[PDB]
């Protein structure tokens, strides 16, 4: 009956926990107490980008490490040129509550979405010369929280309906649907090989999905509150998750574990965005104390602070070449640090 | 710089000009978050002055108001309400005919009044069953003491105003609910946000006028607090 099924599920969970504990031999700290420190990393605001009307809720870096997309809940999607603080594009939105944006790897399309329930793909390379809504994706009974581009024709989304969805842009339908989340999924991170992706939700969990017709491969727990940011390791064998309990945690894909925790007794606000450097030594996280913190990803200690923001830092990103770190906050400002 | 860089700078300046033009409109439009319940008549209030979010744009004294009905969303709200940290007011609509679903409505004002990202945001209360409330309380089937005890130990406050003379045992019926909501909204967040109560009907006009008056008061108080006045 139902009791038997619940007992079987509890036994399976206990077996998974026991296997994880048995596989736990050495922590990250023990295998990193000997490597030399990364030193006092001191970045500075090189370019500050202004023009948005309201709070910036998401941003994404183009694959060229030069172009930027920023989403503002005035109903705007601005494409910047970070080298010359220039506004390449300014896309108005049918809705005004946008919680996510994404740049396609090719650079021909831009994703958008929010409380409107619909993922909008805009085409930046029309012959008419104006960015136009190329495809509206409906099928989500809840707010879109994060969208990512696999290629020019497939998109991956997470919504407030506790589900993720892999869409074919041409047909406009859901090629695959990922269920198994008991709360709003807020962020998802694409693997470098574009075959798997992690997704963090408000049920204090992060699940790993297989894009090519798959389901939840692994589940990762340990956060004491809602996970509202996620980012893969450059190897794709680990990922960092930020929660609003002032903790960013590192998990390893090959062991189903929590390698390290990045917390300080003097930080009590949430963590809105998380990102990684090119080499993986630095973990960057934006907090609700108007601050960005860079951490030595091997020896868990604070490496540096970027404190130029006057409101909640919402989005973070690191270029593909690791040249700079862009931070978008609620003062309608994006700042580049390197 | 090169020619194609100067032209890019010019394009950026044109984008900035258009953005300035849009910010003029954005700053002059007061965004309201319409947050009611299924039994509440919010879907009729929006129709009288007329998936995802539903935008309803109206204008009373040449001032643009933009209400946002949250539609096809889940049963949890603690996440997207952060997007409404900059709105002028939260219009909370409660149906007063249904006494049974009023404690549930009661334990939703507290989740809005006492929640962060909303301490500077005021709440406009719309009790939207006045005709239905009168119809229920004129009969004997409705019994406030039954659903809600301690109703007897309460009298109509000196500050009361039966509009068309109304009818006894009706004004007290409205004012018990009003006082309960205002007690929930009183003993917390003093000096940052205020609750404005209003008795209304679904087909009643001048509801937009009430929203206009409350927004005037909210912005007045915020502007006074910008100075060191109060």
């Amino acid at each position, epitope marked *: 009956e139902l009791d038997q099924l619940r007992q079987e599920a509890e036994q399976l969970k206990n077996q998974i926990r026991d296997a994880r504990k048995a596989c736990a031999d050495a922590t990250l700290s023990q295998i990193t107490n000997n490597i030399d420190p990364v030193g006092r990393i001191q970045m500075r605001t090189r370019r500050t980008l202004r023009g948005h009307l309201a709070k910036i809720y998401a941003m994404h870096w183009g694959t060229d490490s030069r172009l930027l997309v920023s989403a503002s809940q005035d109903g705007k999607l601005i494409i910047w*040129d970070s080298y010359t603080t220039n506004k*390449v594009h300014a896309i108005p939105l049918r809705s005004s509550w946008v919680m996510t944006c994404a740049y396609a790897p090719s650079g021909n399309y831009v994703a958008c979405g929010g409380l409107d329930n619909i993922c909008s793909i805009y085409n930046l390379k029309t*012959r008419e010369g104006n960015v136009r809504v190329s495809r509206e994706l409906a099928g989500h009974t809840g707010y879109l929280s994060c969208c990512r581009f696999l290629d020019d024709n497939q998109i991956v989304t997470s919504s407030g309906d506790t589900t993720c969805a892999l869409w074919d842009i041409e047909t406009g339908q859901q090629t695959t649907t990922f269920t198994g989340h008991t709360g709003d999924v807020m962020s998802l991170s694409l693997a470098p090989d574009t075959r798997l992706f992690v997704s963090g939700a408000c049920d204090a969990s992060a699940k790993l999905w297989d894009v090519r017709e798959g389901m939840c491969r692994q589940t990762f727990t340990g956060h004491e509150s809602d996970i509202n940011a996620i980012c893969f390791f450059p190897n794709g064998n680990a990922f960092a998750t930020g929660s609003d309990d002032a903790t960013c945690r590192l998990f390893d894909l090959r062991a189903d574990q929590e390698l390290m925790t990045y917390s300080h007794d003097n930080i009590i606000c949430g963590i809105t965005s998380v990102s990684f450097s090119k080499s993986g030594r630095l973990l960057l996280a934006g907090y609700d104390d108007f601050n960005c913190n860079v951490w030595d990803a091997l020896k868990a200690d604070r490496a540096g602070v970027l404190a130029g923001h006057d409101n909640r830092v919402s989005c973070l990103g690191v270029t593909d070449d690791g040249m700079a770190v862009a931070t978008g906050s609620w003062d309608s400002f994006l700042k580049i640090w390197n | 710089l*090169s020619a194609e860089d100067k*032209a890019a700078v*010019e394009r950026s300046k044109m984008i900035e000009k258009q953005l300035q033009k849009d910010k003029q409109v954005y700053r002059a439009t007061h965004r309201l978050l319409l947050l009611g319940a299924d039994n509440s008549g919010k879907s009729t209030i929006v129709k009288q002055m007329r998936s995802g979010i539903f935008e309803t744009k109206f204008q009373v004294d040449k001032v643009n108001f933009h209400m946002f009905d949250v539609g096809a969303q889940r049963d949890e709200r603690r996440k997207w309400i952060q997007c409404f940290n900059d709105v002028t007011a939260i219009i909370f609509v409660v149906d007063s005919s249904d006494y049974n679903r009023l404690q549930e409505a009661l334990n939703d004002f507290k989740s809005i009044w006492n929640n962060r990202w909303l301490r500077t945001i005021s709440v406009i209360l719309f009790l939207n069953k006045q005709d239905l409330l009168a119809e229920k309380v004129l009969a004997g089937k409705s019994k406030i003491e039954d659903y809600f005890p301690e109703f007897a130990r309460y009298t109509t406050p000196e500050d009361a105003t039966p509009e068309p003379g109304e009818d006894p045992r009706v004004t007290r019926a409205k004012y018990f609910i009003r006082d309960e909501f205002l007690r929930i909204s009183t003993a917390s967040g003093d000096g940052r946000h205020y609750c404005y109560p209003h008795f209304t009907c679904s087909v009643d006009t001048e509801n937009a006028r009430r929203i206009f008056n409350d927004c005037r008061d909210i912005i007045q108080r915020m502007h006074l607090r910008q100075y060191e006045l109060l």
Partner: single-chain antibody
Amino acid sequence: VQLVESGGGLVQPGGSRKLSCSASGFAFSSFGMHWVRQAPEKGLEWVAYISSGSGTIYYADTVKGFTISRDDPKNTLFLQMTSLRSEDTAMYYCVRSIYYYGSSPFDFWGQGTTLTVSSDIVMTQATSSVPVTPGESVSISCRSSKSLLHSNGNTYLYWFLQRPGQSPQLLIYRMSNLASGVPDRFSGSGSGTAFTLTISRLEAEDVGVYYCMQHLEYPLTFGAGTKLEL
């Protein structure tokens, strides 16, 4: 995407003609416009440019004081000819060009209207009668009197194709990037002060006249014009 134009014909040396260009299926209000001249049985030359919106207008050393204006609501680019010197009896082509990062200026061209009339970086394309057979490979060379390599590492050489009885079509922009909707068999290489365009497996649709453009200094200079006689 159509960029037609009209207003030409036979004009006396009195120097009075208005000549307009109407665009359909465009974002004409957000796209820069160019007027480009081509003398009969001769090469090309750049006449005028109007930026997005307005405020950035350039002229040649010959046509200065041939005014050019825009009409965004009607999508019409206007050219006023104040003189009818006999050297201006050239076909006039509208050019659509947008300048942002990664853009492709001189993307689409209109269809020229003939009006028969009764510092300056020099582009050299010496060869003009290259004989080729179908299925072979062609290589055209253009040279720059200055260095078309700004400090930002962006070469500004443009390769255009004009088949007989047809408007020029964009082939290569910035010496390395292929235009949209052109065969992949075309390629462009260079190192500054000297560039080449290579065509592999000529398919009998590549026969025409090839032109090279600078886009460093707004006085835009054309190549001599190499013709593949086939």
